């Protein structure tokens, strides 16, 4: 499912782009409804993916059920948190966040708000 053109998404980490090992990291995902129809945000997932193989799954973080209605022109932000495992410190991982939302017409959308290689440093 591709992201709808009328939806915008802004991610912001609460404490920066540092990913200390064994520490809670929290981010905020924004949502814009630039379309004339109601978008229903379903869930926001997070996962660690292999650097060389973005398809391979290393760690799957639980899927947060949001179930929030975004009226037209209104912005909905959704928060999520996790904790990276201690052994992952000192290695790079491909962190893929995907935002799910469906219009009333049943069209599926899954925006890759963030798809980049981040490094978790040992503290």
């Amino acid at each position: 499912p591709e992201a709808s053109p009328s939806a915008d998404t802004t991610i912001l980490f609460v404490k920066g782009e540092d990913f200390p090992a064994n520490n809670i990291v929290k981010f905020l995902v924004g949502f814009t409804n630039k379309g004339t129809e109601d978008f229903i945000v379903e869930s926001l997932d997070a996962s660690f993916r292999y650097p060389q193989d973005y398809q391979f799954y290393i760690q799957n973080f639980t899927a947060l059920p949001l179930n929030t209605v975004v009226p037209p022109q209104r912005q909905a932000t959704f928060e999520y948190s996790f904790i990276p495992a201690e052994p992952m410190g000192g290695r790079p991982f491909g962190l893929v966040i995907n935002l799910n939302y469906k219009d009333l017409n049943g069209n599926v959308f899954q925006d890759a708000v963030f798809n980049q290689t981040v490094t978790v440093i040992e503290r």
Partner: protein
């Protein structure tokens, strides 16, 4: 779009919402837009006064102007009066993206569902959380303090210098 943009967050700073105890609610607004979000107002009507007692803080507040790349923290302290499943919904925030710009209505993050316990349970999961070592001394007082002190009274009595 270069207008202002506000990413609000509503979260709890309490592990457990204890009946009759203070519960902390922190509403943090971040302005990720290039321009300042003028005339920001936060409203939170999802806490009826019949379940929570507002120890401190005001649910409905205003802000004249939030500078770009700046965050404003507001906190309200309540008191969960009833143990049970209490749904924390999303508060409404309205802000101007531009001078004479339209009002962009948004919704803050919703923690969702949580569990309020009773006072006795609060004691049995974490009462001496950082008092743990001191409590350990009290538990070990019979094992160490009492025998040692008692014996010292005996030794002093018979250990007379000659």
């Amino acid at each position: 779009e270069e207008g202002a943009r506000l990413l609000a967050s509503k979260s709890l700073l309490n592990r457990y919402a204890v009946e009759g105890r203070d519960l902390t609610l922190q509403y943090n607004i971040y302005n990720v837009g290039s321009s300042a979000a003028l005339d920001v107002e936060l409203s939170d009507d999802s806490f009826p006064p019949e379940d929570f007692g507002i120890v401190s803080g005001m649910l409905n507040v205003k802000w004249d102007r939030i500078a770009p790349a700046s965050n404003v923290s507001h906190t309200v302290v309540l008191r969960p009066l009833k143990a049970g499943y209490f749904n924390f919904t999303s508060a409404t925030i309205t802000y101007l993206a531009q001078e004479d710009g339209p009002v962009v209505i948004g919704s803050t993050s919703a923690p969702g569902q949580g569990g309020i316990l009773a006072q006795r349970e609060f004691d049995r999961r974490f009462s001496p959380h950082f008092l743990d070592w001191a409590a350990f001394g009290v538990m070990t007082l019979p094992s160490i303090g009492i025998p040692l002190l008692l014996w010292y009274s005996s030794k002093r009595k018979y250990d007379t210098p000659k």
